[PDB]
Design an enzyme around this catalytic site. Sequence first.
Site, mmCIF file in Angstrom:
data_model
loop_
_atom_site.group_PDB
_atom_site.id
_atom_site.type_symbol
_atom_site.label_atom_id
_atom_site.label_comp_id
_atom_site.label_asym_id
_atom_site.label_seq_id
_atom_site.Cartn_x
_atom_site.Cartn_y
_atom_site.Cartn_z
ATOM 1 N N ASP A 25 42.937 48.797 41.943
ATOM 2 C CA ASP A 25 42.411 47.879 41.241
ATOM 3 C C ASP A 25 41.153 48.278 40.402
ATOM 4 O OD1 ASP A 25 41.243 45.176 40.689
ATOM 5 O OD2 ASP A 25 41.261 44.581 42.668
ATOM 6 N N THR A 26 41.277 48.456 39.034
ATOM 7 C CA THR A 26 40.297 48.919 38.090
ATOM 8 C C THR A 26 39.349 47.698 37.832
ATOM 9 O OG1 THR A 26 41.925 48.379 36.254
ATOM 10 C CG2 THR A 26 41.900 50.754 37.276
ATOM 11 N N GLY A 27 39.643 46.727 38.201
ATOM 12 C CA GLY A 27 38.734 45.409 38.025
ATOM 13 C C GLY A 27 37.719 45.427 39.477
HETATM 14 C C1 017 Z 1 41.195 40.009 43.767
HETATM 15 C C2 017 Z 1 42.621 40.682 43.147
HETATM 16 C C3 017 Z 1 43.739 41.226 44.179
HETATM 17 C C4 017 Z 1 43.082 40.099 41.796
HETATM 18 N N1 017 Z 1 42.014 39.843 40.929
HETATM 19 C C5 017 Z 1 41.566 40.911 40.166
HETATM 20 C C6 017 Z 1 40.563 41.910 40.794
HETATM 21 O O1 017 Z 1 40.532 43.082 39.855
HETATM 22 C C7 017 Z 1 39.089 41.245 40.660
HETATM 23 C C8 017 Z 1 38.561 40.948 39.148
HETATM 24 C C9 017 Z 1 37.350 40.349 39.053
HETATM 25 C C10 017 Z 1 36.011 41.132 38.569
HETATM 26 C C11 017 Z 1 34.770 40.571 38.675
HETATM 27 C C12 017 Z 1 34.628 39.249 38.885
HETATM 28 C C13 017 Z 1 35.739 38.512 39.550
HETATM 29 C C14 017 Z 1 36.756 39.111 39.524
HETATM 30 N N2 017 Z 1 38.046 42.024 41.272
HETATM 31 C C15 017 Z 1 37.476 41.788 42.421
HETATM 32 O O2 017 Z 1 37.679 40.641 43.215
HETATM 33 O O3 017 Z 1 36.808 42.880 42.843
HETATM 34 C C16 017 Z 1 35.868 42.580 43.959
HETATM 35 C C17 017 Z 1 35.592 43.724 44.641
HETATM 36 O O4 017 Z 1 34.637 44.470 44.272
HETATM 37 C C18 017 Z 1 33.638 43.660 43.177
HETATM 38 O O5 017 Z 1 33.507 44.093 42.063
HETATM 39 C C19 017 Z 1 34.118 42.998 41.139
HETATM 40 C C20 017 Z 1 34.267 41.845 42.020
HETATM 41 C C21 017 Z 1 34.217 42.221 43.222
HETATM 42 S S1 017 Z 1 41.666 38.511 40.537
HETATM 43 O O6 017 Z 1 40.273 38.368 39.544
HETATM 44 O O7 017 Z 1 41.368 37.640 41.754
HETATM 45 C C22 017 Z 1 42.874 37.978 39.702
HETATM 46 C C23 017 Z 1 43.964 37.365 40.497
HETATM 47 C C24 017 Z 1 44.886 36.810 39.528
HETATM 48 C C25 017 Z 1 44.844 37.022 38.138
HETATM 49 N N3 017 Z 1 46.053 36.608 37.426
HETATM 50 C C26 017 Z 1 43.913 37.639 37.704
HETATM 51 C C27 017 Z 1 42.637 38.078 38.383
#
Ligand code: 017
Lengths: 99, 99
Positions: A25-27
């Site tokens: 999960d690069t996000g």
């Molecule tokens: C939770 C994931 C399985 C899926 N998601 C993408 C995810 O990469 C999010 C993307 C993301 C990024 C920033 C803010 C909100 C969401 N990252 C995330 O929740 O990371 C958390 C863990 O480390 C922290 O760093 C960033 C937030 C924290 S998500 O944002 O909920 C999501 C779900 C469904 C879709 N279609 C698009 C995005």
Amino acid sequence: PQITLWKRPLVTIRIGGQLKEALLDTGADDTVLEEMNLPGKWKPKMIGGLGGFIKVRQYDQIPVEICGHKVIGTVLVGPTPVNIIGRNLLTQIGCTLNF
Amino acid sequence: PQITLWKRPLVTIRIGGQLKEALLDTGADDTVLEEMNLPGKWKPKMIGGLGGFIKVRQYDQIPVEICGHKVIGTVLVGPTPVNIIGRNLLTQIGCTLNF
Ligand SMILES: CC(C)CN(C[C@@H](O)[C@H](Cc1ccccc1)NC(=O)O[C@H]1CO[C@H]2OCC[C@H]21)S(=O)(=O)c1ccc(N)cc1
């Protein structure tokens, strides 16, 4: 490995002799796993994502094996919709995005 | 290019006349962008992350330019805290994870 994105980048990880499936999960800044027991001290923390904030237990210097690559770092445990390997550990296995 | 994961993989995307900064996000099934008034028909949708679900509008067949690469697909629009480029569009630029 090279992993394409037509399907979810799900891989098997080893943590504490347990095998789990986790999403590359690069996000995600951080690595967050579903409720489990890990040994050692932990700190209560909060992190925010798409739908708001959850409470997690922060475990530091935890060994994890990701596709046979050994990392040692911070693992957050709490109510995540799926096990996610974040950038804190993706960096340790030398993972990059390429196009 | 090769993008390391020491920092958030933010890139410039173009959609219509609007430039935006977005996350190259292998953890996201679909692309989701902050507030914008796209043309054409849309369907309501709920997507879940850490903390629960948010409501978005699904717009299909939307042209997007990502790092100079013209792409076309579904764009979800709603109150995401960060703009996210999901697998649905990452595949169209031939993006892989490599380690
Ligand atoms: C939770 C994931 C399985 C899926 N998601 C993408 C995810 O990469 C999010 C993307 C993301 C990024 C920033 C803010 C909100 C969401 N990252 C995330 O929740 O990371 C958390 C863990 O480390 C922290 O760093 C960033 C937030 C924290 S998500 O944002 O909920 C999501 C779900 C469904 C879709 N279609 C698009 C995005």
